[PDB]
Amino acid sequence: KETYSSYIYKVLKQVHPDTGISNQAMRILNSFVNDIFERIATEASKLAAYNKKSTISSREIQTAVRLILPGELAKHAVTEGTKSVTKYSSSAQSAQSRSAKAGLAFPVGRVHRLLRKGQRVGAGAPVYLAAVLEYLAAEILELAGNAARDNKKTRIIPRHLQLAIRNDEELNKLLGH
Amino acid sequence: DGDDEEFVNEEY
C-alpha cells in the first residue's frame, strides 16, 4: 500500500503538462500501480524459485511482465524496461540517483526495497520494474487525459479513468472488473 | 482531501 502519487504526478506533467488530476482519481491510479507491482513481483519471485535461481534478476522481471501484461502493453513495457536497464548500466560512473541513472521518475530504490521484503534482488531488477510501472502509469495517464480533453475538462476525474480503462481492450483486460 | 478536489503534490 505504498504511495506513488508524487511520481505519478511527475509523469502526468510530462504526458499532459496542462492537465490536472483529482484526489480520488490519483488514489485510483495509485491503487492500479500497487496492484500491478504485486502481480509482477510475485510472479517474478515464483519464476526465480521454480528455476532454482538465488537472485531475482531483470530476466525474471521481464518474463513476469509478459506473463502478467497483455500483448501490446507487454512489448512496450519490455521496451521501456530494457532501455532503462541499458541506460542504468552505462551510467555506473554517474554521481546521480538510481532513478536519474535509469532516466526514470519512479523511485528505483523503493522498488528494490519492496522487492526484497516480500530472496536476493539484482540491481537491474528494480530498474526494470520501476520502468514498467512508470510506463503503465504514463499509458493510463495519456489515455485518461485524452478523455478529459475530449470531454472539455482540464482535470482527470475518476470517470475519465473508467473511460480510458474500458475503451482500451488491453487495459480493460488488465484492470477492468 | 475532497474526492473532486485537485490533487496537490505535497513533494517538490
Residue numbers in the entry:
A (entry chain A): 37 to 154, 158 to 216
B (entry chain C): 112 to 123
Can I see the authors' text?
We solved the crystal structure of the histone binding motif (HBM) of Sad1 in a complex with a H2A-H2B fusion protein and showed that the DEF/Y motif of Sad1 binds H2A-H2B. Only the Sad110-126–H2AB complex yielded high-quality crystals that diffracted to 2.15 Å resolution. Sad1112-123 adopts an extended conformation and primarily contacts H2B. The loop between α3 and αC of H2A also contributes to Sad1 binding, and this H2A region is conserved in H2A.Z, explaining why Sad1 does not bear a binding preference for H2A or H2A.Z. The binding between Sad1 and H2AB is mediated by electrostatic and hydrophobic interactions. The acidic Sad1 peptide sits on the highly basic surface of H2AB. A series of acidic residues in Sad1 (D114, E117, E121, and E122) are oriented toward H2AB and form salt bridges and hydrogen bonds with the positively charged residues in H2A and H2B. In addition to electrostatic contacts, the side chain of Sad1 F118 inserts into the shallow hydrophobic groove formed by the α1 helix, L12 loop, and α2 helix of H2B, and is embraced by Y42, I54, and M59 of H2B, which ensures the specific recognition of H2B by Sad1. The Sad1 F118A mutation destabilized the Sad1-H2AB complex, and the substitution of Sad1 F118 with a positively charged arginine residue (F118R) severely diminished the interaction between Sad1 and H2AB. We also created a combined 5 R mutation (F118R/D114R/E117R/E121R/E122R) of Sad1 and found that the mutation completely disrupted its binding with H2AB. Furthermore, superimposition of Sad1-H2AB with the nucleosome structure showed that the Sad1 peptide occupied the DNA binding site of H2A-H2B in the nucleosome, suggesting that Sad1 does not bind nucleosomal H2A-H2B.
